Design a protein around this ligand. Structure first.
Ligand code: SF4
Ligand code: SF4
Ligand code: SF4
Ligand code: SF4
Ligand code: SF4
Ligand code: FES
Lengths: 127, 166, 127, 756, 120, 196, 102
């Protein structure tokens, strides 16, 4: 599993993911948006885990309106996922204290946890 | 044209829609049976305008998600909602629908607002049929523009009017 | 018998005396404990005039030099007790009808209690 | 070994075993209130009662398994109807006077009284009989309630079940009898005429008390026992690294408790480490700050990294300083090492680096100290390495590591008797003042600063010392397996440290080196020390510098660019720093440390509110980008790979690393920085007065210098300006002023002046 | 005792000058997420002081997730109505009318005022 | 009457017989003898196949032979042609790295959906099944939920101002392998049973 | 150990308070063992196979679902039947998907 970007750097994370994704087809990939506080999205932060099935890609909690330009970064990100043909979007709810260590767990544990906790979501709520 | 752009016409059409609210039940669990009780001959949601009940989704404005929404049912309910006419509203009935409820696990969606734009929430396990009527009057006066939250804000008539569907 | 009511009344009376001595001498008074039969009474009725079971006079250091307690509403052999900590001194007051509050046979007057408290303060109080 | 049978099972068990431990070693259970691990069992609660046969020859009356020895081929019965009936009756006698506080009791879900009650009480008497909970229908004992014994400890004398745990501990383990019963009969209650609770280990009675009598004032009324999230980690306040458990709920730190690891700290924590948590969760920095208009402004991480790129664009790689904190993890130390390897710079260092590396000396294990014959000590264990006081309390009583049962540490060690006599001939101590442990140091001499080197010369034998020093020399000679213990005075003076090395090499003897830095030996093992040029953590040599701590103002003064990675906000940064960044505390960190005994220790992250903080690992990774160099470490997993490549053993593994190089520095002796247990950044909340600064002076020199016994005197050091209460002590050598070193700057001699 | 884990209780020490509860401890923060709450009554069943007791109001349907986490001062016996009902009565100036009637209120609800069978 | 002959037949061939004093009976057959033995059981007149229940003993305080254990329930209807009413369980342990077991679908068509369920929840593969398809867990679900190595997947509960609850750290109840909040658990909280 | 103490004497007995507190927080610990009991509901045979490990929470609970085992006979039952009757034959079999899916 790869980890790109850095926390609280929305545009750096967005550009790093733009470069790293390339021409990868996301028709069978699963996009996990990791966040806290289900209800309040105005101050929410977001991390991303991209489970392609053959390899996974991690981006730390650097998206969302919680950071300057992070809202537009999340919108562009989800828009690009949809453009690349991603259909399966999920929203994972972790505790604020978890969110940091969860990206420091080993890949298999982190991915099993995310797949267990993820909720099917309308990507439109991030557009 | 969405019921807008004239002071009298929009209030009139909102009146019309509010009283003509057409429920389409999406029964999942025991919340669905407690909603079936909201139609019997003790307390009927058959007076305000909800007498008729068209199983088709092309024919109703109100989508009432009644029960626990399993993650395997989420895309089905998603597409049933997308396959509705556009002036449409969403009620989330019961704890399992509103939040994860007492079933906090891999199987159940922890907020139906994740998949569908929810208009009204109604707690309870099950929520009483009269609480559901309170919710539909709540939605009624919401589409009348008579609804406010605890913060003082007026609420838009139609949620799912604010989302980039795709 | 019905002595209980006047016993709790005189208990409130003794508490009033303790508060007055505290305010006069500028020494700390403390309500130590309330009645469990009033805390944990949920719907159950409470007829006692006050809900306070234990009180104390503590010196400047907070270590008590005088302790006073009353038996709960439901206990057998009801009494009121006094204790000088560190002095191995214990007193047991009852209530005799017509006479008043008595330690054994000796009437327990406010003046008696004031003299006992002053001696206790001067001897036991550290600061 | 001795052959025992518990109710259906057969057990091998060492001879000195307690019957209770043989019971639990067989896997059975029995009430337990009076006895405690590492404490002398004495039958007080009378809860451990079992049946014993030694033939079928049953004993007449029930044996207290806590204070009953085991005999070869002995039968022990814990399931008899009579045994369980007596257990229930004793539980009732214990519950006789209890105050009915369970719902409002801070002891909550974990109350030994509650649990043994629900385990063993209300025996099945023989239908649908209506049973009675309580037969006692009289007035319960009502005594003083919720009495603060100290800024950290509260006392409920009603909840006390009159076991012996707290007074037993106070007499045995710390050796401070500051708690005892007053009256007798049922009027017995805990009290003291020593009110402050002087012992620096008082807080453990809170963990020991099986009831809610002794509770933690710093965590009173915060949450119930089950509700708290437990983060097991290690304390990085000093290099002994006790295991601790950080209780956290809803993003805030509530309470610190001990984590048992008999290898180093048994079940004990020091008061400073345990109650000095108020600062971590109260006021700290959450946003990176950048200097724009001669002042600091909150900025995005992007804007701060932009300022970083700009300020380092014109920077040459041999003027950049890399200065880490005393608690810096092995990963961070190794990443700094590798990054200054690639980026050639001669000066990197860490906050508490000593003139003489601790890696000079062979680390000793605490059980090696228990088995050792002699202990030669220079420094103050109580303030420099607190729990060394407790391991020396075990040592002094001839105690030795117990046998390891199936339930782990023995519940009742027959090796530990009550009121044990303490030997004064087993060790020698030399401190600049009359240290508390001198009570147990027959051979003891109060010397002055900079005299250690001469005591060690005398111990080597190239000259002749005082009576005490010659006695210490002689005892060390006679010692077959002695342990030498060295503090900051030794570790900060090149010549003294070298003479210690010589002594402990000539006689085969291990060393316990009390570094002012927590991960000093691990950072040394990771190669974090300055080079030839040598701008150290206290030296203003570099032109660009990164700081993971607060330097002397003279180190900041002059530099072109300084980037400080702190957790709290310091004025010294809003007047000299250009870019500040938030850092997480060791409570919420994850990584490894190296014990002063060479053992690697894990830091698990606690769910405390960090803000947007980032580890120094990521900070250095991002700082290298502005310089062009690519860092080898970004994450904990890659850091662990490269660590294990660096051949640092598994956790609880001991790390072997020596070093032979000395960096000497002159010491301007006018003021002394007294090594303190309490640390400056801990002076928050209830630790406010406990972590105060002190200035100690001999009454004559104080009188000459006009220093009253109660005065709050301000003092100016190169390390800043601090106010300190003035204490007169007749054991402090004349002509000196001992100033409280409440940081990892202990043991340093500095100029200065008393401001008025 | 909450199977849905819907109750958050932050405690604090009673102030002798102006006390709140009967012991040395009271409810500083008492929140219940009605959307998580499954309505057992186990909270009352574990209530040793009879503080928490299920009531009779059912007209609690509301629009926002974050508004359905009821606080202490939304549940005290003194309050008459549900959150939307009270909000409507304030933005309306028309007093709250509950949509229920009962023969009587249980003793555990002592203080809870309700319309009873026609007693009023 | 047919149960007595089952006990007599199992005891003679060295099949362990587990019994609780509550009235429940097991007959544990080895992996080899499982298929043919239960075929013989159906031949003995066991009309009805009630349940196929899979068990993951990973987190059990006492150890067991293998991690997984499958338990079948066989019955003979009392009101049918010649109904005794004899009902009993057959337990068969299954290795962690060999999640194989022959189906009895050919014997009872009841085992069809039950064995599909056991395959869904545990990685237990049933040999000879007409269709082993995931029944209950979502089509895209990865793994087998009910084996203890699979997380329950809880979501935190939410309140007003940063106040949240994590159930796994909020739970006061203890499991069998949970030591408890005191130094140990004994007595009732290491297991309790009343004497009727 | 099974039943919480009577709520009226929660203000009198230490044993009552302790047992109330412990019971409502931790609960109680049944013996180590597996158990099952059958019952007749309006949809057939019902039962719980309970493995308890001596803890306060059950080690595992499996439910025999009559609505689940009854559904294996649906393709057979409605085999050859009418298309409108495929709904009536499902309604007549009395299914409950809360029981089936579970
Ligand atoms: S909230 Fe209660 S009634 Fe509604 S579906 Fe969930 S369990 Fe059934
Ligand atoms: S000390 Fe234990 S038994 Fe006593 S009130 Fe506290 S929790 Fe209850
Ligand atoms: S205060 Fe606690 S530890 Fe001390 S004797 Fe009493 S019950 Fe034992
Ligand atoms: S400061 Fe040192 S002695 Fe105290 S808890 Fe921390 S590691 Fe242990
Ligand atoms: S009724 Fe009480 S115990 Fe039950 S879910 Fe609601 S708050 Fe929790
Ligand atoms: S008497 Fe207290 S445990 Fe032995």
């Amino acid at each position: 599993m790869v980890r790109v970007g850095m926390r609280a750097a929305p545009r750096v994370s967005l550009e790093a993911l733009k470069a790293a994704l390339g021409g990868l087809k996301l028709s069978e990939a699963k996009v996990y948006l990791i966040t806290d506080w289900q209800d309040k999205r105005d101050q929410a932060r977001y991390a991303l885990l991209l489970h392609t099935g053959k390899k996974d890609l991690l981006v730390p909690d650097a998206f969302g309106p919680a950071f300057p330009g992070g809202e537009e970064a999340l919108s562009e990100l989800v828009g690009l996922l949809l453009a690349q043909g991603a259909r399966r979007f999920y929203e994972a709810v972790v505790s604020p204290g978890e969110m940091t260590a969860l990206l420091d767990l080993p890949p298999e544990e982190l991915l099993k946890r995310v797949m267990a906790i993820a909720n099917p979501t309308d990507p439109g709520i991030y557009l | 044209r969405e019921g807008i752009l004239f002071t009298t016409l929009e209030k009139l059409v909102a009146w019309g829609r509010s009283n003509s609210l057409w429920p389409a039940t999406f029964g999942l669990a025991c919340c669905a049976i407690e909603m079936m009780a909201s139609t019997d001959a003790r307390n009927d949601l058959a007076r305000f305008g909800s007498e008729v009940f068209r199983a088709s989704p092309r024919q109703a404005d109100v989508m009432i998600v009644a029960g626990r929404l399993s993650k395997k049912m989420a895309p089905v309910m998603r597409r049933v909602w997308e396959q509705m006419p556009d002036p449409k509203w969403v009620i989330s009935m019961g704890a399992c629908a509103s939040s994860g409820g007492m079933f906090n696990n891999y199987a159940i969606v922890q907020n139906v607002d994740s998949v569908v734009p929810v208009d009204v929430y109604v707690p309870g396990c099950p929520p009483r049929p009269e609480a559901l009527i309170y919710a539909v009057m709540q939605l009624q006066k919401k589409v009348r523009g008579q609804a406010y939250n605890e913060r003082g804000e007026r609420l838009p008539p139609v949620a799912a009017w604010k989302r980039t569907r795709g | 018998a019905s002595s209980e009511r006047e016993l709790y009344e005189a208990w409130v009376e003794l508490l009033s005396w303790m508060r007055e001595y505290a305010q006069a001498k500028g020494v700390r008074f403390e309500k130590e404990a309330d009645f469990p039969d009033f805390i944990y009474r949920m719907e159950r009725p409470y007829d006692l005039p006050t809900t306070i079971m234990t009180a104390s006079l503590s010196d400047g250091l907070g270590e008590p030099f005088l302790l006073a307690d009353v038996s709960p509403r439901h206990a057998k052999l009801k009494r009121i007790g006094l204790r000088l900590p560190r002095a191995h001194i214990h007193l047991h007051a009852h209530y005799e009808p017509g006479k008043g509050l008595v330690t054994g046979k000796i009437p327990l007057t406010k003046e008696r209690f004031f003299a006992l408290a002053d001696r206790a303060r001067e001897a036991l109080a550290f600061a | 070994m001795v052959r025992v049978k518990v109710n259906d099972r057969i057990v091998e068990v060492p001879p000195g075993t307690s019957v209770m431990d043989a019971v639990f070693h067989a896997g059975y259970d029995v009430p337990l209130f009076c006895s405690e691990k590492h404490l002398s069992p004495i039958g007080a609660c009378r809860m451990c009662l079992v049946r014993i046969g030694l033939p079928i020859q049953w004993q007449p009356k029930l044996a207290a398994s806590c204070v009953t020895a085991v005999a070869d081929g002995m039968v022990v019965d814990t399931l008899s109807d009579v045994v369980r009936e007596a257990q229930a009756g004793m539980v009732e006698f214990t519950l006789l006077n209890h105050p009915l506080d369970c719902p409002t009791c801070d002891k909550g879900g974990a109350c030994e009284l509650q649990d043994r009650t629900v385990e063993y009480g209300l025996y099945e008497k023989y239908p649908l009989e209506l049973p009675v909970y309580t037969r006692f229908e009289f007035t319960r004992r009502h005594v003083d309630k919720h009495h603060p014994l100290s800024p950290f400890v509260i006392l409920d004398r009603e909840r006390c079940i009159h076991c012996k745990r707290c007074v037993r501990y106070f007499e045995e383990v710390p050796g401070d009898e500051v708690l005892d019963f007053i009256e007798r009969g049922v009027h017995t209650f805990i009290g003291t005429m020593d009110f402050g609770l002087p012992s620096g280990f008082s807080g453990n009675i809170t963990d020991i008390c099986p009831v809610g009598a002794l509770l933690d004032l710093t965590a009173r009324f915060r949450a119930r026992n089950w509700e708290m999230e437990e983060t097991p980690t290690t304390c990085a306040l000093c290099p002994v690294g006790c295991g601790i458990t950080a209780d956290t709920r809803s993003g805030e730190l509530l309470r610190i408790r001990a984590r048992e690891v008999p290898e180093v700290n048994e079940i004990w924590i020091c008061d400073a480490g345990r109650f000095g948590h108020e600062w971590a969760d109260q006021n700290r920095l959450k946003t990176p700050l950048v200097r724009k208009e001669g002042r600091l402004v909150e900025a995005t991480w992007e804007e701060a990294f932009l300022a970083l790129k700009e300020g380092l664009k014109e920077a040459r790689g041999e003027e950049v300083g890399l200065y880490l904190a005393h608690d810096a993890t092995l990963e961070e130390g190794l990443l700094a090492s590798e990054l200054a390897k690639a980026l050639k710079t001669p000066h990197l260092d860490f906050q508490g680096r000593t003139a003489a590396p601790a890696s000079l000396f062979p680390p000793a294990s605490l059980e090696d100290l228990l088995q050792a014959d002699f202990a030669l000590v220079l420094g103050d264990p109580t303030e420099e390495a607190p729990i060394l006081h407790l391991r020396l309390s075990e040592f002094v009583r001839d105690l030795k590591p117990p046998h390891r049962y199936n339930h782990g540490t023995p519940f009742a060690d027959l090796q530990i008797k009550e009121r044990m006599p303490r030997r004064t001939d087993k060790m020698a101590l030399f401190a600049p003042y009359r240290a508390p442990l001198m009570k147990w140091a027959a051979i003891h001499e109060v010397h002055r600063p900079g005299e250690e080197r001469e005591i060690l010369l005398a111990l080597l034998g190239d000259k002749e010392g005082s009576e005490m020093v010659a006695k210490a020399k002689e005892a060390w000679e006679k010692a077959k397996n002695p342990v030498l213990i060295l503090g900051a005075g030794v570790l900060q003076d090149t010549v003294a440290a070298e003479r210690a090395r010589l002594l402990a090499e000539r006689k085969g003897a291990k060393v316990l080196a009390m570094t002012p830095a927590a991960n000093a030996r691990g950072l040394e093992a990771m190669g974090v020390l300055p080079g030839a040029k040598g701008a150290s953590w206290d030296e203003p040599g570099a032109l660009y510098a990164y700081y993971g701590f607060v330097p002397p103002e003279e180190a900041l003064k002059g530099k072109r660019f300084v980037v400080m990675h702190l957790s709290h906000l310091h004025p010294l940064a809003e007047r000299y720093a250009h870019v500040v960044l938030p850092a997480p505390t060791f409570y919420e960190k994850r990584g490894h440390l190296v014990n002063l005994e060479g053992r690697v220790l894990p830091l698990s992250p606690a769910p405390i509110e960090n803000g947007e903080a980032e580890g120094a690992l990521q900070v250095l990774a991002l700082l290298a980008e502005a310089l062009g160099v690519r860092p080898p470490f970004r994450l904990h997993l890659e850091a662990q790979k490269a660590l294990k490549a660096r051949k640092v053993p598994e956790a609880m593994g001991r790390l072997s690393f020596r070093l032979k190089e000395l960096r000497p520095k002159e010491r301007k002796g006018a003021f002394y920085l007294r090594p303190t247990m309490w640390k400056a950044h801990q002076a928050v909340g209830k630790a406010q007065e406990a972590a105060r600064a002190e200035l100690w002076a001999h009454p004559e020199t104080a009188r000459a210098e006009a220093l009253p016994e109660g005065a709050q005197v301000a003092v100016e050091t190169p390390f800043g300006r601090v106010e300190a209460r003035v204490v007169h002590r007749e054991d402090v050598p004349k002509g000196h002023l001992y100033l409280s070193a409440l940081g990892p700057a202990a043991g340093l001699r500095v100029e200065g002046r008393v401001l008025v | 005792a909450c199977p849905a884990y819907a109750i958050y209780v932050e405690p604090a020490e009673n102030d002798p000058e102006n006390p709140v509860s009967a012991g040395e401890r009271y409810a500083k923060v008492y929140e219940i997420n009605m959307l998580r709450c499954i309505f057992c009554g186990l909270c009352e069943e574990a209530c040793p002081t009879g503080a928490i007791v299920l009531g009779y109001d059912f007209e609690m349907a509301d629009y926002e997730y974050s508004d359905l986490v009821y606080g202490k001062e939304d549940m005290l016996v003194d309050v008459v109505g549900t959150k939307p009902q009270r909000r409507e009565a304030k933005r309306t100036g028309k007093p709250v009318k509950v949509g229920y009637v009962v023969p009587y209120v249980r003793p555990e609800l002592e203080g809870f005022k309700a319309p009873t069978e026609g007693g009023k | 009457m047919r149960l007595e002959r089952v006990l007599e037949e199992a005891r003679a061939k060295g099949y362990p017989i587990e019994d609780n004093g509550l009235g429940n009976l097991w007959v544990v057959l080895p992996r080899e003898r499982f298929k043919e033995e239960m075929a013989h059981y159906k031949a003995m007149g066991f009309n009805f196949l009630a349940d196929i229940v899979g068990l993951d003993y990973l987190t059990y305080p006492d150890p067991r032979p293998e991690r997984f254990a499958v338990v079948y329930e066989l019955v003979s209807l009392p009101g049918w042609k010649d109904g005794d009413g004899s009902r009993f369980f057959v337990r068969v342990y299954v290795p962690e790295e060999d999640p194989r077991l022959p189906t009895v679908t050919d014997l009872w068509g009841s085992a069809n959906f039950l064995e599909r369920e056991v395959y869904d929840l545990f990685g237990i593969v049933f040999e000879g099944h007409p269709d082993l398809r995931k029944i209950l867990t979502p089509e895209d679900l990865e793994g087998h939920p009910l084996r203890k190595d699979y997380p329950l997947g809880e979501t935190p509960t939410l309140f007003r101002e940063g106040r949240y609850i994590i159930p796994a750290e909020f739970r006061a109840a203890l499991t069998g392998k949970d030591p408890g909040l005191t130094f140990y658990k004994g007595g009732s909280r290491k297991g309790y049973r009343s004497l009727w | 150990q099974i039943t919480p103490p009577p709520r009226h004497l929660l203000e009198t007995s230490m044993e009552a308070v302790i047992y109330h507190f412990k019971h409502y927080t931790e609960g109680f610990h049944p013996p180590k063992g597996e158990v099952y009991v059958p019952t007749e509901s309006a949809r057939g045979e019902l039962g719980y196979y309970i493995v308890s490990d001596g803890g306060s929470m059950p080690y595992r609970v499996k439910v025999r679902a009559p609505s689940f085992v009854n559904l294996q006979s649906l393709p057979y039952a409605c085999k050859g039947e009418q298309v409108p009757d495929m709904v009536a034959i499902i309604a007549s079999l009395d299914p409950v998907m809360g029981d089936v899916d579970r």
